Amino acid sequence: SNAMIPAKLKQGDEIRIIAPSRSIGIMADNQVEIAVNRLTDMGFKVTFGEHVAEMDCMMSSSIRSRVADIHEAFNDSSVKAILTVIGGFNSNQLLPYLDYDLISENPKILCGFSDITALATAIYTQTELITYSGAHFSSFSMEKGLDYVMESFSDCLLQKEPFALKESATWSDDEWYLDQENRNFIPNEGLVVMQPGVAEGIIIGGNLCTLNLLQGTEYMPNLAGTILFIEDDFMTIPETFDRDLESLLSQPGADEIEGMVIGRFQQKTAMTAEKLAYIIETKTALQKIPVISGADFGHTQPIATFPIGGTARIDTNQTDKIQIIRH
Amino acid sequence: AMIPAKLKQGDEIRIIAPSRSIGIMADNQVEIAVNRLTDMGFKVTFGEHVAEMDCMMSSSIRSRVADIHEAFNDSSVKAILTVIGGFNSNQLLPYLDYDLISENPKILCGFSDITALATAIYTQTELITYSGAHFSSFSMEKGLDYVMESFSDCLLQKEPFALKESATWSDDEWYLDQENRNFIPNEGLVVMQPGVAEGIIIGGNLCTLNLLQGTEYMPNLAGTILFIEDDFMTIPETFDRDLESLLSQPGADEIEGMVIGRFQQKTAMTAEKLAYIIETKTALQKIPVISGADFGHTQPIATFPIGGTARIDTNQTDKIQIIRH
Structure with missing residues (x-):
């Protein structure tokens, strides 16, 4: 087909966390550690975008800032996957300002849901990179009943079949x-x-x-x-x-x-x-x-x-x- | 860009229910509201299907379209007021005969969900429509006075x-x-x-x-x-x-x-x-x-x-x- 399937995740792969909707400020500090430890236990290196912690009166960050973190994530070749911190309302603000040529040249996993729909779809339609509706970074901070989420995360992004x-x-x-x-x-x-x-x-x-x-x-x-x-x-x-x-x-x-x-x-x-x-x-x-x-x-x-x-x-x-x- | 002629004492107004059924209005408020337009010198009539209520508190597409078409079809109807708002007047858009509408310019007035209907009607026929009082609006006992003036300013006059x-x-x-x-x-x-x-x-x-x-x-x-x-x-x-x-x-x-x-x-x-x-x-x-x-x-x-x-x-x-x- 035409649609690009990005490389699947393997052990030791760096995963970048970005906040294209709501700032990670919304998450309790210790919930962040829960998610970090789950993703690390699963075999991954977790890293955070420069601006994730920035927060404004909508509990989000500025456009300029979100785009930069996105561009850095796609641009950095060590980054095998991008996970969004959490959903929100405002990822659609970014759509005009993204460099789709950049993205189209650096295919990699991008994953999140709800409001992230806007972002993952625009990327799909502009570049033909297949993107994902699935766990956020914060999704991994949920204590109980996480099995299904991980199994399915794995089915989808850790293997081809x-x-x-x-x-x-x-x-x-x-x-x-x-x-x-x-x-x-x-x-x-x-x-x-x-x-x-x-x-x-x-x-x-x-x-x-x-x-x-x-x-x-x-x-x-x-x-x-x-x-x-x-x-x-x-x-x-x-x-x-x-x-x-x-x-x-x-x-x-x-x-x-x-x-x-x-x-x-x-x-x-x-x-x-x-x-x-x-x-x-x-x-x-x-x-x-x-x-x-x-x-x-x-x-x-x-x-x-x-x-x-x-x-x-x-x-x-x-x-x-x-x-x-x-x- | 056409324009509906203004309500003049004695003109027939048609009440239609493109979103929710009049069945959500208190019966006595329909009576209240009906006295007012009448004192304002208008004859008030209702579409056949305004009383129909389904599980969404609305009615079938076919019903709502039919009422819309008889309201425009009828040369004696000078103004069309929606009963009230809702969520679903957008389901109606593909089924309207915009030709019939374009050839029967008249006043269509409503607000909220009625925005979908009024906008489609304008962009398809170039017939100017209104975001304004519902029929139900006039059932409001007190504080009704500005509603009246603004309405009147818009639909009862040319200035x-x-x-x-x-x-x-x-x-x-x-x-x-x-x-x-x-x-x-x-x-x-x-x-x-x-x-x-x-x-x-x-x-x-x-x-x-x-x-x-x-x-x-x-x-x-x-x-x-x-x-x-x-x-x-x-x-x-x-x-x-x-x-x-x-x-x-x-x-x-x-x-x-x-x-x-x-x-x-x-x-x-x-x-x-x-x-x-x-x-x-x-x-x-x-x-x-x-x-x-x-x-x-x-x-x-x-x-x-x-x-x-x-x-x-x-x-x-x-x-x-x-x-x-």
Whole structure:
């Protein structure tokens, strides 16, 4: 294919941490050490961008500063992977100011989720570098239930073979950054098949309302021949999820969408099967394509890691319904 | 750029429900609201499907489109008021007969989610539409007086006018408790950035306007005065991101000016964050910008044209003047 797969991570590889959305100032100091020790135990050298600790009234840093840390990360040949500190709202500010030629010449892993969707997508569409929706640096500071996250991080970035995106045994919706000890783990009922079928396609997705931010710009990926992986957080309610989806499915290529896989909603959103069904059902672009929900990604725990611009196959009759092929 | 003829005593107004069902309004508020337009000398009629309510508190696309088409189809209908806002008027856009519309210019007025409908209608037909009072707006027992004037200023007459800061403003659910309101001295407008500007007026609800992006409904932003606004669900960082995304749309390099509606209190906007937000927007550099205008999810709210025109003089007493409308 055309899409560049960056080199996979190996022991002794340097990993650079950058804060393209919210400053690492948001994290407690000791949570940082938890993440550092996990990534180091996994075989990696952790290093931090010059400006990560800088923080402004939006709890972020300046544009000038974020771009510089990004450019340094891509430019430094010892850096085999870039992880973002944590999500936020503002990574889209950076899109015009990036040197895509630089990036396109220095392909390497870039990984994070939610707001990072904007950044990882723009990079994909401008350079054709396959990027990743998956753990942040802070994701590794979560004390309990981290197994799935690491396994999946590894499936995706430590080895080449295709892999099933497998249901976790238990999931939670917790603010675990405030309270690590009192977790509420819920037996996982599994993927729900909303509409049956078999399809394969380019993976596009991450955070729904973040991906909408790319609309009308040169960074918006075409939607034809894609499996959409979509997700959204507690701020969403079913009716806003629906407008955002409707709007997304009005973008170029929307008529050739191959399938859809939806991340578990946070409990606050109160998304019943009935409403989800009604939302899917009234979308023209989703007619007679496979649609699955309840997947492990989005804003609940745990989260898988999947490529943006890699490929997937959906099959609703199989035991493992989601297969990551090119990653 | 066409223009709907103004309401004249006796004219038929049609009430449609493009987002949420009238079934979310207290029945007696529909009665209240219906007395007012009637005292204002108008005959009030309803679309067949306004009472339909689904699980989203809205109704089927087909229903809503049908009401829209009979409202334009009907030469005796002189004005169309949306029942109220919601989230879903954007589902309707691909199904409208814009030809039928272009050939029946008339007044369409609503605010909030109705921004999607009014904007599409303007950018497809060049028919000027309005961000202004709902039908439901007139069910408000008290503090209704500015709503009336502004409305009247816009849709009952042909002259220019200005946009008075209101004497008092509020953030209250007056449809739940009409009697216990907390009104307020208006500190009035705020100059974020100085200057003078005239051009085309664009779009009410920010996050709603975002949904048009990437589609044939998105109006070009060249030579435009942005009147933006968003409700309590928005926080400064989302408003900032939504703004950032809008200012990346075609023609944003040529924006002439910006007016920003009073925020709801739960948003928790501050002078400092508001300012940090403007400064960091490239497209906004060395043009005029004003906070605290009266529209959006506060009360009272003005009614201005989408596609009509405005002059902004930061050097004056009345800084916001609506010309064409």
